[PDB]
Design a protein around this nucleic acid. Structure first.
Ligand SMILES: [Zn+2]
Lengths: 44, 56, 123, 112
RNA sequence: GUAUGAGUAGCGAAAGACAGGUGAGAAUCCUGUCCACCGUAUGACUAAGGUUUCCUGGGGAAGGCUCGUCCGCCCAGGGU
RNA sequence: UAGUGAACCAGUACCGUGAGGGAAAGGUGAAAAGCACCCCGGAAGGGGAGUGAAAUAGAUCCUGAAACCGUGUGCCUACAA
RNA sequence: UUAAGUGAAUAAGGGCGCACGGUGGAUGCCUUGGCACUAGGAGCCGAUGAAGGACGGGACUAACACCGAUAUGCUUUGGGG
């Protein structure tokens, strides 16, 4: 009966962070796609 | 099961003729003449059979 | 009888309420609890008339042990223990009375549950 | 020259079906008996129409009328106020709403 | 947006009773008494996780599956 | 309910770990002059007295339809498929 | 007086017509925002540190805007009363 969304603080930022969306050319697509809508939280 | 139809406005009211509130026996006191329940201690009077009962 | 709860819980209920009225002589409860307390209190004052060892050693059921009631000193702190009150006060009060040591009066329904409420006294 | 003072109480947090039960028992009677009638019914809608009649009596005294012993409850209403709306988590994932209702209550006290 | 079903089903495993408080109001808040339940845990300390819920004083429109003078709720200060 | 998704503190609240998806919400009066004071009630809420041309324009504030819920009354209704 | 026969009236509740209220915001009027274009300008910013942001600044400060330890702003040249 374990359910999914079992949080850490490390894993949120070493998967969905900032540096692992700056170290590609696809994380930059993600960031420059969110900046078009101009959402507040760019990434977690 | 499942109700087959909307019941109309008439059969709302034809049920509810036995959904009343009624009030039973209301005597009047001796020491105040105020309308209070039979066989019960008269609360504002504090008396029953002419005695300071509710005192403590 | 009147079932109110499970089996042993009625013994707990009536030892609770009938070791009261020995101490206070007024009680405010519901209707049906008052009728069971009628029967059990008047069965436990007729032991207060005898004064034997069987009067004591049948009062070991419906008497809570460590229960005090004090209007008392000479030069001391001396304590009646709510069974001593039966075998010293309520016996000689109704030494000449026959049965029927109680009154039940009908006051009001309770605000929370519309349960009608009731006063018990002795004399 | 006018009789028949008014008194209301708006958005009372009681359901409008249940409060029409009590107002069955008041329409057409004298004022001085209907208060005694209200004091023995054990309902939530009992201890509100008391306050409505007492404010209506105070209006008829301090504004217009005389003769408290000669007042008749002639009219009494129940209308529906606005409703709150909330939900409840019902089993197997879904949810079903819950209404919460309110009523407006008026009572008119003529003389005779 | 509003009906019908309908003032129906349900109110999410348990033991409470009395006296005295406070209060516009009390089964449901506070105090006392006895009774009862677990006790390799319904007791103690901590790692994550939550992010001010903690403490002090006030409040009752909404939340609390009823009530509520009470709260892990609201107002105002303050503690790491 | 149109016109950008958005006339209003909107890519906001909300939802999914994530890339992503995404709402609802305009109007008192010319002027706030937004009801001093009295009365019932713990308050909420109302009734007088006032402001205002108008308060059934009282802050959910222009006009205010329909379903739906009530009150009062002219006529009918307990041998009827 | 007896006998035969004929039989009205009332409503626990309900239906229709009228009249007055309550919830709810269609419709009438309005515009603080959009849509599609016209004519002209302009068609790059950046290691002298960019676009986009985090944190802070007011007497009180939760938010928006403006600003940046010289922080709700400083110097100079023209306008204006
Ligand atoms: Zn009396």
């Amino acid at each position: 009966m374990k359910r999914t969304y079992q949080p850490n603080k490390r894993k949120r930022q070493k998967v969905h962070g900032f540096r692992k969306r700056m170290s590609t050319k696809n994380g930059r697509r993600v960031l420059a796609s969110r900046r078009r809508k101009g959402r507040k939280v760019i990434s977690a | 099961a499942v109700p087959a139809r909307r019941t109309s406005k008439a059969k709302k009211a034809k049920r509810r003729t036995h959904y009343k509130l009624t009030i039973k026996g209301l005597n009047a006191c001796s020491n105040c003449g105020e309308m209070k329940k039979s066989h019960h201690v008269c609360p504002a009077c504090g008396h029953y059979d002419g005695k300071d009962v509710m005192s403590k | 009888r009147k079932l109110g709860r499970t089996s042993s819980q009625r013994k707990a209920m009536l030892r609770d309420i009938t070791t009261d009225l020995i101490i206070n002589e007024r009680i405010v409860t519901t209707e049906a609890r008052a009728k069971e307390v009628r029967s059990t209190v008047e069965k436990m004052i007729t032991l207060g008339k005898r004064g034997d060892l069987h009067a004591r050693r049948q009062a070991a059921t419906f008497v809570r042990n460590e229960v005090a009631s004090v209007r008392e000193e000479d030069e001391s702190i001396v304590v009646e223990s709510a069974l001593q009150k039966l075998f010293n006060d309520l016996g000689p009060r109704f030494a000449e009375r026959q049965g029927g040591y109680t009154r039940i009066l009908k006051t009001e329904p309770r605000r929370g549950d519309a349960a009608p409420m009731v006063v018990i006294e002795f004399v | 020259q006018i009789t028949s003072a008014k008194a209301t109480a708006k958005t009372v947090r009681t359901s409008p079906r249940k409060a029409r039960l009590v107002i069955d028992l008041i329409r057409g009677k004298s004022v001085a008996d209907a208060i005694s009638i209200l004091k023995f019914t054990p309902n939530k809608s009992a201890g509100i129409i008391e306050k409505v009649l007492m404010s209506a009596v105070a209006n008829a005294e301090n504004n217009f009328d005389l003769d408290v012993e000669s007042l008749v409850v002639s009219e009494a209403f129940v209308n529906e106020g606005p409703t709150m709306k909330r939900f409840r988590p019902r089993a197997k994932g879904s949810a079903s709403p819950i209404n919460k209702r309110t009523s407006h209550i008026t009572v008119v006290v003529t003389e005779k």
